Amino acid sequence: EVKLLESGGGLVQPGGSMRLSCAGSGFTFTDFYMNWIRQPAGKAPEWLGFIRDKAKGYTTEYNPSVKGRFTISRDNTQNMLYLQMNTLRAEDTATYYCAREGHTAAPFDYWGQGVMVTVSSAQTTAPSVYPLAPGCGDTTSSTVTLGCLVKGYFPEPVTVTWNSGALSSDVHTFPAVLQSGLYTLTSSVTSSTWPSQTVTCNVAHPASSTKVDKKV
Amino acid sequence: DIKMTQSPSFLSASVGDRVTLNCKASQNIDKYLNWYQQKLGESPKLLIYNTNNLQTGIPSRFSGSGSGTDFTLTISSLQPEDVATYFCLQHISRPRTFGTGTKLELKRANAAPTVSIFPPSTEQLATGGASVVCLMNKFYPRDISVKWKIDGTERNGVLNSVTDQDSADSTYSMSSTLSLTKADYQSHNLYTCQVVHKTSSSPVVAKNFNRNEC
Structure with missing residues (x-):
């Protein structure tokens, strides 16, 4: 619970690929689903996908809206989650947040502060x-x-x-x-x-x- | 996909009043509907889950209800720390979808703005550019209009920007910019910022300056 911290570049040119990373402090990383949600300035959040428990096998589901281009992975050994984006387009410009799923209080009981990804040449x-x-x-x-x-x-x-x-x-x-x-x-x-x-x-x-x- | 709609989009209420937020799903979502509060410059935070469960640490003035396709978030008495945008979230099915959102504005007594005009900096000039600035501050309501006029003539190569409601006095501030080349800035003399606050005053507010100086 305590803390979720995202890091990862911001300015990228169209077509490129980018990797945001999210770190989790204060809870057993491995016992939770983890999500990526993004929000274009001036608009509602948009759910991207999540990676399951250690119990469900760390599998992943993605919003069809992006699927194919984005992949999610964990590094359970050091409580990191990653969002790998490919073929970044202009509308992918937004603030990206990782958010723990949770038990009972869920989904998204805890968010990170976010990081802006700007896609432009x-x-x-x-x-x-x-x-x-x-x-x-x-x-x-x-x-x-x-x-x-x-x-x-x-x-x-x-x-x-x-x-x-x-x-x-x-x-x-x-x-x-x-x-x-x-x-x-x-x-x-x-x-x-x-x-x-x-x-x-x-x-x-x-x-x-x-x-x-x-x-x- | 399940499409979520929220209403109304904007909502002005006095501190202490009863406020009600609506959210309509396009399919039955049964009981799986959440609410998030997102203050300015912050990540959304969980308010309620599955139409009516408050989360830990959230004030009792909040409550949720409805079921199936219509849901409601109700704030008994509006506190000033409740000014924010509110999001609805459907999660019975993937992809999980959010509602369009609702923004709350605390209401207050009309206030005429303090207008201020700034001629270009000698530095910006020394680089052949020139931006005239007009800060139009601490006003209410939000509706207002500013116009630039060089030598009495309305003008346009302008740039406006309005803040969000201030957490301290609930006013709004606006900044308008008039960018010109050094040359054109120099072949004119009286620059003006005229604001009309559809309210506060009729005679409109004008601030100017003579480039050669008064």
């Missing part, structure tokens, strides 16, 4: 980060809203924080948007004591090991 490109400070003769109250433009990056996601979490007051990080094959996103924060304090946004893009600290 675009390339890993880091973001450009611009500070957003109130401009050209603009009045402003005692609490000023400031922001950061995170532009032209791929693929998702990026991470924005303020004053390294120290100022997590009024913070709004807006969902990304696809402008001609690249993601652009915006983040706002609020500060009384605007100028004399120092506000910095911390952006990070893992798909490029980018970590930027833009001061405003």
